[PDB]
Design an enzyme around this catalytic site. Structure first.
Site, PDB file in Angstrom:
ATOM      1  CD  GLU A  35      -3.049  -0.861   0.008  1.00  0.00           C
ATOM      2  OE1 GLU A  35      -2.951   0.128  -0.758  1.00  0.00           O
ATOM      3  OE2 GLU A  35      -3.935  -1.737  -0.121  1.00  0.00           O
ATOM      4  CG  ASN A  46      -8.675   6.157  -4.698  1.00  0.00           C
ATOM      5  OD1 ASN A  46      -7.666   5.489  -4.921  1.00  0.00           O
ATOM      6  ND2 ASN A  46      -9.130   6.378  -3.477  1.00  0.00           N
ATOM      7  CG  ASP A  48     -13.840   7.249  -5.806  1.00  0.00           C
ATOM      8  OD1 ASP A  48     -12.749   7.788  -5.523  1.00  0.00           O
ATOM      9  OD2 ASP A  48     -14.470   6.549  -4.985  1.00  0.00           O
ATOM     10  CB  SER A  50     -12.178   8.728  -2.497  1.00  0.00           C
ATOM     11  OG  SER A  50     -11.715   7.602  -3.215  1.00  0.00           O
ATOM     12  CG  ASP A  52      -6.654   4.975  -1.197  1.00  0.00           C
ATOM     13  OD1 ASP A  52      -7.846   5.182  -0.899  1.00  0.00           O
ATOM     14  OD2 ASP A  52      -6.304   4.086  -1.997  1.00  0.00           O
ATOM     15  CG  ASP A 101     -17.374  -2.601   6.525  1.00  0.00           C
ATOM     16  OD1 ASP A 101     -18.173  -2.058   7.315  1.00  0.00           O
ATOM     17  OD2 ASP A 101     -17.514  -2.565   5.285  1.00  0.00           O
TER      18      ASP A 101
END
Ligand SMILES: [Cl-]
Ligand SMILES: [Cl-]
Ligand SMILES: [Cl-]
Ligand SMILES: [Cl-]
Ligand SMILES: [Cl-]
Ligand SMILES: [Cl-]
Ligand SMILES: [Cl-]
Ligand SMILES: [Cl-]
Ligand code: NA
Length: 129
Positions: A35, A46, A48, A50, A52, A101
């Site tokens: 990561e 990202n 979209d 967003s 990270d 989750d």
């Protein structure tokens, strides 16, 4: 901060991530490797819109607030900037929520693609833990 491999393993263990939700320490170190290359200051935008953040590349769509991800949530109740600290506490606490989750560590696509099913113990091999 760019952690050493064993240094990060130790910090993750200190913060209760070892075997959290059944995921051994090597899984967490492997995920962090791919990561962020162990860099707490890693950020990545990202498609979209967003972003990270941090050693585990936690996404602003669901988990933290960065003020520029429309329609998103902040389920870890933290500013995304908190995930860039040299102190990994916020990243670890939020990762605990993420991995709980429903889909376990598959939440991290890179973990699924690069760590899952591999010899993840190699990531903590030799470390004084
Ligand atoms: Cl390494
Ligand atoms: Cl392991
Ligand atoms: Cl936002
Ligand atoms: Cl911006
Ligand atoms: Cl929220
Ligand atoms: Cl905030
Ligand atoms: Cl730390
Ligand atoms: Cl699971
Ligand atoms: Na958000």
């Amino acid at each position: 901060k760019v952690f050493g491999r064993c240094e990060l393993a130790a910090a993750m263990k200190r913060h209760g991530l070892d075997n959290y939700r059944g995921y051994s320490l090597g899984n967490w170190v492997c995920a962090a490797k791919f990561e962020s290359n162990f860099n707490t200051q890693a950020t990545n935008r990202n498609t979209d819109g967003s972003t990270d953040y941090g050693i585990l590349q936690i996404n602003s769509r669901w988990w933290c607030n960065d003020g520029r991800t429309p329609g998103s949530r902040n389920l870890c109740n933290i500013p995304c900037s908190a995930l860039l600290s040299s102190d990994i506490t916020a990243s670890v606490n939020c990762a605990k929520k993420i991995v709980s989750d429903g889909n376990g560590m598959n939440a991290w696509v890179a973990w699924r693609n690069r760590c899952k099913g591999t010899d993840v113990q190699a990531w903590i091999r030799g470390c004084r833990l």
